[PDB]
Amino acid sequence: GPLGSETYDFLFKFLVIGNAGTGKSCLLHQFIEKKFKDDSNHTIGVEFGSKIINVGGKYVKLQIWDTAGQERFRSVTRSYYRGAAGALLVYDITSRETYNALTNWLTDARMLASQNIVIILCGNKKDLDADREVTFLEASRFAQENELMFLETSALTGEDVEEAFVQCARKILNK
Ligand SMILES: Nc1nc2c(ncn2[C@@H]2O[C@H](COP(=O)(O)OP(=O)(O)NP(=O)(O)O)[C@@H](O)[C@H]2O)c(=O)[nH]1
Ligand SMILES: [Mg+2]
């Protein structure tokens, strides 16, 4: 994967944000490696990944900053919002607390990045439907009201992970 071997037309800076334990790191690992990370522990500060996707015939390299959700890491994660084109905003459909935090994540994102940062809302862990605390309906209405894209995902199965990243990039390229 050296510099001279890659082909891309666009370079986008993305970040993944949301409460601790929502599955942000598993989402990135799923996207890059097409595997469910085993024994995922809390991210210490931040981690990084990149992947080139095909969006409408153009190749887009996504530089992805997987930020720690724990409040102790707030100060070291400020940097990754600045000049970011898009963000996956993640909550856990089994934890209402993670959903209730979205307004604050959203507000901080739009203040630190440009107000027009493209945000896709990811209701993660949808494979755990027996433990669901947040309905699809209320989340979709929250997204509509706050001009966010929205889908539910499973980092465990892989379902909708690729689509979340791709649709975020798609919206950036085209009005
Ligand atoms: N069943 C299920 N478990 C998931 C899913 N995504 C993540 N998990 C699990 O949920 C826990 C947290 O995942 P993790 O990616 O580490 O969360 P995080 O948002 O990165 N946490 P932090 O902000 O502290 O780094 C782990 O035990 C992980 O295996 C999912 O889609 N389904
Ligand atoms: Mg993490």
Q: How many residues are there in the chain?
A: 175
Annotated binding site: 21-26, 40, 42-43, 66, 69, 124-125, 127, 155-156
Contact 68, 44 (CB under 8 A): yes
- Return the axis-axis angle of helices 24-33 and 161-173, rounded to nearest 10°: 90
Q: Assess whether the C-beta atom of 17 lies below 6 angstroms from ligand 1.
A: no
Tokens matching residue 131: 């433990």
Number of the ligand closest to the Cα of 90: 1
Q: Where are the domains of the chain?
A: 9-175
Q: Assess whether the C-beta atom of 69 lies below 6 angstroms from ligand 1.
A: yes
Which atom of ligand 1 sits closest to the CA of residue 40? Answer: 16
| Sheet order of strands, 58-67 included | 46-55, 58-67, 10-18, 86-92, 118-124, 149-152
Q: What is the resolution of this structure in A?
A: 2.1
Q: Return the half-sphere exposure (C-beta side, CA atoms, 13 A cut-off) of residue 125.
A: 22
Statement: 9-175 belongs to CATH 3.40.50.300: yes
Q: How was this structure determined?
A: X-ray
What distance in angstroms lies between residue 14's CA and the mean position of ligand 2's atoms?
A: 15
- The single-letter DSSP state of residue 116 is T
Annotated binding site for Mg(2+): 25, 43, 66
The CA distance from 29 to 70, in Å, is 19
